[PDB]
Amino acid sequence: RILPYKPPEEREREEFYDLWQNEEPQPPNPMHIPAPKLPPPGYDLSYNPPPEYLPTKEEREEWEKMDPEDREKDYLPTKYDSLRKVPAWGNFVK
Amino acid sequence: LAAQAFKLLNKYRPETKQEKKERLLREATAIKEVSKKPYTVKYGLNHVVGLIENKKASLVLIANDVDPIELVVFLPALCRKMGIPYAIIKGKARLGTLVHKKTAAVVAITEVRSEDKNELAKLISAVKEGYLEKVEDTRKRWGGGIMGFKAQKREEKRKKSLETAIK
Amino acid sequence: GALKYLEELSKKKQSDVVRFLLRVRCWEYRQLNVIHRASRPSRPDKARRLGYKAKQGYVIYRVRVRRGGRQLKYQRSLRATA
Amino acid sequence: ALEKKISRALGRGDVSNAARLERNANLPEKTGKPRYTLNHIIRERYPTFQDALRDLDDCLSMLFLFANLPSTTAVPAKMIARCERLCHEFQHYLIVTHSLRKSFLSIKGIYYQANIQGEDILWLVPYKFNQRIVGDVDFRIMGTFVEFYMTLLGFVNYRLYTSIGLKYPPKFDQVKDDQGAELAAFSLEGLNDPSQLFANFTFFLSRETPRQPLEFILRAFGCKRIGWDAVLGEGAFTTDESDPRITHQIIDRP
Amino acid sequence: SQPGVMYIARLPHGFYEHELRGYFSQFGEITRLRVVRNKKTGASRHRAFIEFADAEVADIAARTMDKYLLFGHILTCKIVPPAQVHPDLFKGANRRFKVVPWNKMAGRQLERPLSESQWQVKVAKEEQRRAARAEKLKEMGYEFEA
Amino acid sequence: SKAAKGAQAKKAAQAALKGVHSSTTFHRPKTLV
Amino acid sequence: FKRAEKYVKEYREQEREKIRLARIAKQQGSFHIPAEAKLVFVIRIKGINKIPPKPRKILQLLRLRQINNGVFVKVTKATAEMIKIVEPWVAYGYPNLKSVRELIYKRGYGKVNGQRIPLTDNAIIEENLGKYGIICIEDLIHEIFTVGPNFKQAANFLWPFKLSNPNGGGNREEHINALIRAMN
């Protein structure tokens, strides 16, 4: 009727399925507004871009000086010589 | 002295309902397939009063906030007449958590294991000299009368009014 | 055997300990309602000899009754009206 | 109400009862799994497996970020370890089924585009560096999303692995993982362009190259002979550079 | 400015000078302190004497720690009456009691060489204490030829 | 001076014996329903 | 305020500490280990409030000032006797490749100009050591794991790792790695 004794060491040593098993189509409700997808990255973002996207030194030094959340884009395109010469993005977690 | 008393009493804590069931189960499983006398902090008001009257309790700890105070009002006099060292603890909840309960009005030690008979005797010499000698001076006299500034002015206003003509 | 000590203490109602306690509790009961519930009995020796147990189903209630008379005398006691 | 009972057990000195009640509270710090069972919520949120694939974009970008992220009090170290696990089992599905299509290098990170069952999935993995968490960042909001995404990708991986035929979860090994195998620590057991681009090809990686992007991409597109130097990991081809059988070496060195 | 002398007995091991000064400096200002020791081995005899700056802070400190359990030691601190304070009570106050290896030091004055004149008179001292031992054992009933 | 030394001795007395530890209208709290 | 038992207790540990350092200095510093140099990772933990000057000076040299703080050192004759002096205050053991790779990558910081910066660029590693042959972040791992001619310059370049407090997770071999995994 009851299980016998087990030592706490043996108890500590002792201690998946498909969600869509019954999968049916459902009409989408008109109230559901899906979140829009982010745009795919462009030629600007590449570490070795075509050289027509590189801003000048005057444009770059003005961009760093002028305050955040007022820029059209959160980055300036940059060219790097090698993969190891590519910094980590400072606002990746942000 | 409170912390030193609970250093000994925590060594002799009565077992909880969970680990008692484990010990019953362990001894049952061995039988299906020699123990010394248990030593434990004694609790229970009618139990401790019987132990004090029979001169078995070596040390008695009484709570100081029993809501009907009559339940413990005789215990310091009973321990003194019987010769048992006693101490009034601060908190029936702290005594209540030493045993696995909510409150406990009184807690006693009868016998301890051989390892700490010296530490029980040092605690007895600590309590009966570091607590009982100070209260020997003030336990026969009345307490209270902690009149403050406002009560002293109000008594002076009272006696000022009874100086012309007591009605 | 704490309840035998409590029985003898209630015999001496005019003593210093009991008259002090009965004074400060009379004031406390007058600050409360005429009928209210007590969590525990204020006289545990008396309640236990009258048939009280600390079980689920037993409750204790406190009550005041105005003493005196109606020169007509009521044939039941004030305990009965309580 | 359960956390009040644990606090009462701790304050009263019952360290045995607090330990037993904590076992009932299935905290993520010792379990590594989400605290609450979210199986029913994901079902009403995605009634069909296609909707699970359409929203896999934000799921994978979160779980790949938290694989490289340090351990905090909202997302404990064991919960980070299961994030790194579920990214690898999804990656082993991609190399076997050859679903990886496109890839891209950006100044932000590496973008991967994969087509599973006719739906494209684009997620971003950071450069395998130290990530700064400067400023006002709330990991309690981050941990709520990871907790949802860890349960979503687990049920997604089971459906995908059973579709090809492999069992789930795939058999993993500590002492391979502790040696640094990463992708190589997992073995896939069978039952109860991308086959031609680098099929006849043998590759070697130096210390200068990103191991995790490169090994995943090359094996997705044909390569079954990849080696690297011993600091990168274990579970490779010949570690030495002097092996005549190796033909192509990826070197980024001045 | 009346100093107060306080006598602490039943000191535990490890409660000797800097901890005794540090603890009772919280109570009040301390001007002198001496812990009694031994010559043959540097070791406390479990007593101490504390001289406070004020007699009032001496009264409070003695009353508070009068019976204090401390590592299985019921402390006893009592205020020494001002008449009973000996003038030479703090002769070694605020100075380290240096442990001196007397058995080591006296053992190697034996092993250091002496002069031939010194060796002869030690020989001379040996023969009269041997003769006295011989005389006292002749009454005992024993004699030694050599 | 003397009063300042007495307060330091009294605070050391209290610590050695008891330790270091030790709008306006009232409305009924919004408890769980 | 300070209790009288705290004063007496500190004398007992210091007397035991003065004894234990005395036997270590008197006895020969020979361990039951092969003479081949290895890599150990030593984490400072909270053992005793008061530290004698000889173990205190070693924690200056090993830069193990704060509690919950770890550094890489290599096993030599001078280092092994340095570790044995500060044995109670440290938790030390043998890393694996997974622990050394993660610890640099999750919490790795650099030593530039008296300042601590996160090594978010390989260009940072260029300007600091450069001439010692290491070129990137993985070369820093290679020098530390397989100890080479520039391990001392590589180990001093990394700031001491400020590990997190675990929630419940002598010499150890692999049991340091469970401590690293819980503390990372």
Add this chain to the structure above:
RNA sequence: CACAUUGCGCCCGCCGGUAUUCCGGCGGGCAUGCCUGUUCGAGCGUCAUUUCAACCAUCAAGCCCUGGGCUUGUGUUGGGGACCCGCGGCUGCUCGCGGGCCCUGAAAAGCAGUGGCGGGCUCGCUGGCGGGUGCCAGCCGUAAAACCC
């Protein structure tokens, strides 16, 4: 809820109509007093909270005449007793060093003495040099060294 008028609230769900919002209907619910329990709380009601724990070698190393033995691993509370000794000094009495016997709760009421090395502090002389010091939580034994840097 309301002399109870086929009237009017509130919570959850459903149905029919141009309906995610509108209208009507429907279904299940919403009195008071008291008991037991659950959960959420309030109180200048009371309490606790500065961690008096464990942590030498439960065997290692070197040996010898090959299997037993040997050597090293320095680790002791304080006080007292017309008691019995050995050795150092003391002209001697005696005092130090170690023993043999006895007593005492981890007991206690000045009786402080051996020369130093380094460091700290202070005083003088021309950072340096020389003196002192009831200062060392630093070492040594009569010189000095070590530590330190």
